[model samples]
Target chain A: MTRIILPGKTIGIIGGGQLGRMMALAAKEMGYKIAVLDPTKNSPCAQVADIEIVASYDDLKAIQHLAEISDVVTYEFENIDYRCLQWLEKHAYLPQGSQLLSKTQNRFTEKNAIEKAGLPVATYRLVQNQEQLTEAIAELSYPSVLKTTTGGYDGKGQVVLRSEADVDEARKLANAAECILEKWVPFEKEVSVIVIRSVSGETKVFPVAENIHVNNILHESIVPARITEELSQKAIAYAKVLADELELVGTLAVEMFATADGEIYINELAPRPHNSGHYTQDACETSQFGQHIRAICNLPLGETNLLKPVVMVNILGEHIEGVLRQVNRLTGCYLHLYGKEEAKAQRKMGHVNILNDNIEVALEKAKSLHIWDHQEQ
Target chain B: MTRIILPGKTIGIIGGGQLGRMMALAAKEMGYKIAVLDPTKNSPCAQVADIEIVASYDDLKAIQHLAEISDVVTYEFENIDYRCLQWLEKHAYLPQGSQLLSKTQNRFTEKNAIEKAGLPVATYRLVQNQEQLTEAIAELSYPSVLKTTTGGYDGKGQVVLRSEADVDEARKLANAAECILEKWVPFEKEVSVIVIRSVSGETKVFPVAENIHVNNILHESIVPARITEELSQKAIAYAKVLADELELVGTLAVEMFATADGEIYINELAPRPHNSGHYTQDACETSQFGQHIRAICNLPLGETNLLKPVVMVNILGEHIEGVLRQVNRLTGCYLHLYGKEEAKAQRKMGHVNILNDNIEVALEKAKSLHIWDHQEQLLEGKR
Candidate 1:
């Protein structure tokens, strides 16, 4: 599992989005060159990368070139084609291969893996067509949701079935794609645990992030989550257990829900640096991106000591126009834009990290600006 | 005096060396584009810059192209032909213009400016030729050093005269170049203050650094220097006085000597982010590179709080092999390399910033490694 990759080597990154852009910046700061493989021209990562190869995920020749030039291969996100990822898994020095990516990207496979790891998740049943969906919904009953097995994010690809009458609309969505029937849990708070593991089996967990979503997209993340020590510990422990089961490398962001009664339920798993942990860049001694780089390189992970209480607010496409107008007035806030060329509604454009005396004050100060107050691209 | 150039604007840096390279990284991280002007092919700064114009200091056309494209013009180092700098001062939005660069680059001009600012400097006499050298030496006497006013660094262009016989060799050097006769002082410690000012009149002084030099080149810098509080305040106050006098923008590294009797004498001035303040990158709330970009862009500066005790040790050309072989074992150390292609004796290849609980422990821990103790650098300085 261990391979020592020193500084100055090239890192080949797949998927040139903001995650890859951030990863490139962190790795480049550590003296490594970056080669980005992307499909889009002038992608956010390509703007900062030393080398940019514009190619589709299925372009095996392009993947081969990126691998040949890079010392180690990694990706920011994995909506990647399976066969191409399998090629990389076999041919490239990919620390975290396609198994986790393949398993985690699908709702059905991910739930199976989580249950196998002995972690508690919301009860769900796999459904291929309307017949299975009807049976699952009949057993699960009203207020259950039918979610597509793949290609879902930010509340997309989901149909909430509150009653038998609403099940008609759910049936229409299920007919279009394979879905999982999930029984909704009565969660009070949304928090996430960022689990990091190195190629050498060294593992560390970041402080929990209390997450808030608006329109199903991440709106805010507050560090030192306003949760009891015991609940935070359970979230962290569950992440560790999942990491061990997966034999993970790089980073794993385990999104969990804390019920009102202090019960923890695994909601989702991201096999990469999650948006919630972006607070680490400013508030922690070592960031999630830095930790991911260290893990993939098999280097000693830097200490993850929290330096201050902080809140991270995501800048959506709608917020860009409003945020840019108030950037100078926003003191005590570190505004990081992705150099994204254009913006439309609901796109993830950039974010701001607010530092203050406490997370509450910081959250209030961030809220006072009204920068994220339903603004437009 | 002030211009809010804003991020996403291109910053035109004059010299494409490590200082420019570092500035480019910081600026680019803040969403600014970088355009570097240098005379070399594939320079360190060029490797990181969005655009690189390879041209000499005297190339006015190249300077014009750089100024034309950049929203604000700044320089990493100032060995420029005076006319070109003046042209930039008049033509471009060059905050921290030619005056400070002009005054600081020359020893005679710098001393006059320092005295005008009401700061104490070492007793020295300027001599242009043999006759002036003789008269200056007679007044300054034995154990004095003769140095070229310009084009001198790391012990070069210097002649140390011990007595009358050594004065014979000093005269030969003085005749070939304009020189300064400086009387030696019994200074116990060397220290520096990093003063940063923005175009908008905001200013800040970083914590003082206790500096040590080897072969006249910077070897190490320890933050929260082992000096009395009173002495540190004096050093900081003196730097403030100097920055105020210069009406500085961007950064100023004011090198000074602290005598046993608690006297502060200005030794030199560097009108750029200096090597001494490199520890800020790892140990402070804001780095010199980060602050320099803020100052030049006229943005509000970040906090200068020292996060922890840090010791920054230079990796010279000879020590690359030794450091690389031992880098993995050196826990708690952040190694930074300039991505320089080759190495020779005395070249500043890179540096390591060691963070620890105390300066003494950090210093001894750094000393114990023996990594910096003649070691070519690819991980051998030649490999």
Candidate 2:
């Protein structure tokens, strides 16, 4: 049976970050009540949610309370444990179920799932012990990256191996946990696509976004990624295949790398709104967050027409002061701050989306922003 | 000296209506904290604000608390007690002063302020007693509007005097209150302009809006006003003149009447967001609510660029179910509902803004809404 969650129902979100904050804003504007579960009081999501269950993400009692009051539940991030989600499934309705989480929680299973879908991925070998490591090295050769199979993010729990001498350090970094050794590929560019699916089996895809990373953190995303028409279609086709294969009832972001030799390989998958899709807020007819809400609620999906071309820039903690000083001078830009206190280095404080008729002009204005040019003394 | 209120500061609002609700949404998006003072718990604004000071509009302790914690204070409407505002000014930073409210709170004083600005107005006379009423009638001739000077809105507290026989009833309705009798100008069309003034003396005006009233309540507001560019410029000019004369530091909505003879008369002034300006939310680069926040916070005003032609239709309480039924079918329309619980007749439940490249298409689509088709049987649903 299909159930249509109306606007008056309550939506419970699991994580309390900027993604959750943007989702709550969309839900509130649509006349729905919101409840969030996070360990921290007054988190970015809690600041706007109707109620915040201040408890650990894995706390069963807190999840129970959230499930009791909410008609549907969704999450902002994919780091949650499958056991906790199983408990939530027994107590309340979880739209994107625990089976998908279990498949995407670890690198080995995620790669297997992608291969099972008959998609092309980077050449890699899984290593569970010293013997397996030797076998992987013998098979994949040097100049490969060794990454832990679980609990890794933002370039963490990984080491690059350039020669035989770097194997010891790679083994130490992957201590106890199973690892994957991937053959390195020099890519010309990175791109991402936001794919959405409804419970009734309807699918929609946003425009491809070109991503540029600095220090392993996303620095900027340019929309309608300066790529060939054929490449864009291929990216969207792969995203739809993955969403359909996973039976995804929510949004998924597929990140891919285009090699210098004109071949594309799957990089990773995020089962929620991705950072690279932030440009959709100011450029698309309906934002990614808004579409996610509509999809999860079983409402008819909104139009995804690209209304304008834009350049999105991420604001780190170090750029907070510089951005504030010149915020009044900024024109043709939409500013969004996460309302987080205590700006430590490399922390994402906010972002800005610059819109213009010409994409090059928008990119130029974004590159010249003083916020990113500030040097730390 | 001017102070630029950056984000992260607290903004205190006086009322908890939909106007405050929309303003808080904009303020929250810019990373500002909000505190609203209203007697109702979980009011429309309270649902989105960070805090709710649950108290009456004139509660001194509540007002003091709001002032003590806020970096700047503004209101959604202008019906607040002037004495309470004076107290707020002494303790808090209110950019929209009370002087403008005093001049526009009453009909006689409001007309006087319009004339003082060198703007044309309908001929009028003040009536404080029976003898003054007789004199006003003789001066203004028959078929004039006799209205109480204060505390009236949306067709309240006024009557039309078609002849001498209606004077006695009009006086009785006045009931010792100061009144104004004016020769009503039969206007061919009604239009309004939303004028914004920053503390730094910068001014920007929104495009003119054509207004249609049903039962003395605003029914719809069409952008571009279907008027000549020359008349639009004249309306904006008068609005700017009024804002400058008042030395306004925030948004002011000036309503005007366009006579058949091509002359425009100043109708009234609203020192806050007006109902007619709601179309800006979806059709303009910056909404009127956003511009008001920028002006009150001493920030640089944003561009008032019209992105698309639009028509804004009011959703009365009686049409809630019909609107909700076909809400999914409507495209190029942005809907905003105030979240009010009960649906009383003639109450403003919400509004929808329809955007199109052509104004006539937008108007036609807005007029053909299913919400306006349902009429109450008046006794069928009653048990």
Candidate 3:
């Protein structure tokens, strides 16, 4: 049986970026103390958290201290060291345990788990050594993306092979780590679902978000994904199935690819709050951050009704000043800044949630803001 | 000209109670650091603020430290010492200013200011000594409430004189402070309006709230107060006039009395967030606390539309356990505990905002929660 962690208990978060910052805000509002572990001093989470342990993610001693101070520990991202996760699982009460982390850390295992849950995923083959690479490449055919199975994110550690001449370049990119050769999907659109599960086995799913990416980074997420109702229902069902299979106690973000033939393929699984789910902050009754806290603390889940149609546009570092300039002109938009000291190009600085009754009007307002034009500077 | 204090600047709040706690929560969400000055250790505001100065509100050195760290200072309560207010005015940038406090702190001056602003208030006389008391008693007659001119809240520091024989007892209760003896009116309902004025002279008013008081402490506040639409509009208009007259750059809660004759009389003013305005936290677009922060920072006022009909029920010490029991039963109620340690009887421990599409259903939900039944507990224990 799951025990309830009341509001007075302390919650320790592992990664101290903007996700951790947003989580700390929700946890603090519910009257809980927060401690964050991060290598960077005065991180976004550090600015609002009660105690910040300035250490790298792999520092087991710092993780031990966090476990000592916190009643239940959670992390904002899934790139943590396996040894650190093992130590936390042995010592502390982590709701989303190390098992989920190991399963979702690599592309091969993650795809295997999804398929085992009776979900459709892109065709991929594991490439361990030279012989396996040749056979897997022959089996999967050419024009496939070769990616390292681990430690790759945000379009890193991956290469596209257009023809037979690109095999050596792709193999060099994969290096020594195990690699996966995935068939290049001709997708019509990219969408994501933020699914949450409580400790008591209660489940809730937020509305699907149709995501738009620029330079392989999320640029905007429009709520009530522009798809047929049948496809939307299928996406939600697939997300629920994955959550049930994982026995998830925290938030899981499932990204999927929808094709012109009306087939949806599961892309990947994020074991925490995702970038595409940020629209829930303004459009839904309870935000994804709030829901994450409620789930991990063993409290009753909040209703996830879509209160308004919204379009969230990310404020990358290149256009931070432009947003500040036209901020006052954008009506019905809620601006959230990460309080980062330096704004470098392509960094996820902040975002604006454009809320309106009409979804088209909301999108129109988001387009007119001119803050997303990253090159005007 | 009042300068705009940006979000990164620090805001220092005096009186670290639930009002300050709610204020700090809103300020932190908007990306501002908070510093709280209070005598209590681990105050509600202290839990959420970036820094807490655990010193008496009147401590000059601590106040100076707060001013040094904070770009601007606002307060959650108005019972501050006048000398301390003067010290802050001279040394720190207090945007609400000491002038508003001086005018609204004392009941006699507060009434006079209302009258001067062409508003209607109960006839009253100030009594400092025995001779003035006699004249005021003769002028205002018996069956009136005698209240101290300053430093009283939640119905404390006041007494009712029902007959000539009660005058001496009332005087003893008044003690050394100057008192105001006013003619008491038989009112139909008690209502309040939370008005906000920005430094740029922008004004916004929340909807009128009908309040029900138990033992002179606010027991519940029902929004869209049970009054005619015209009376509500008039109440809002009077609140704006008072805000204009005071040149208020922060939130001002104006409580008034709606009598059986369909006329509204100004009761008093609280120069901070009021208990009657707590419904805005769940029911309105921008809460009173958010409005207070925006006004003090000289930002554009937010929309004050009442999104839902809600009834806010105050949780006193006796109701804490009762709420804990029925919390699971409350489906749509938003529970906000002040994180206070001691739950002394009649102390404001926390509150629950019950929201529904219909006001009557909301009130029914609030009543059925069994938290407001203070006498039931005493009866159960006695039985």
DockQ of all predictions against the true structure, Cα-based: 0.42, 0.37, 0.31
Cα shift from native, residue A142, model 2 (Å): 7.0
Candidates by TM-score, descending order: 1, 3, 2
Which candidate has the highest DockQ of all? 1
Candidate 1, residue A211: Cα displacement in angstroms equals 2.0
lDDT of 1 at A110: 95
Candidate 2 lDDT over residue span A194-221, tens digit each: 9998766667899999998887778889
Q: What is the lDDT of candidate 1?
A: 0.84
What digit string (tens of lDDT, one per residue) describes model 3 on residues A70-161?
99999998889877888888878887788998899999999989999999987998888878878878898878888888884544577788
Stretches of candidate 3 off by over 4 Å are A128-147, A152-172, A184-188, A224-231, A258-263, A325-331, A375-377, B82-87, B130-143, B161-171, B174-176, B259-262, B322-327, B341-343, B367-369, B375-383
What lDDT would candidate 3 get against the real structure? 0.84
Regions of model 1 farther than 4 Å from truth = A141-143, A153-155, A160-169, A375-377, B134-143, B161-165, B374-383
Over the stretch B80-107, how does candidate 3's per-residue lDDT look in tens digits?
8888888888888788988778888789
Report lDDT (Cα) of residue B166, candidate 1. 90
Could you tell which candidate, 1 or 2, scores higher by lDDT? 1
Candidate 2, number of clashes = 0
What DockQ number belongs to candidate 3? 0.31
**lDDT of model 1, residue B60:** 98
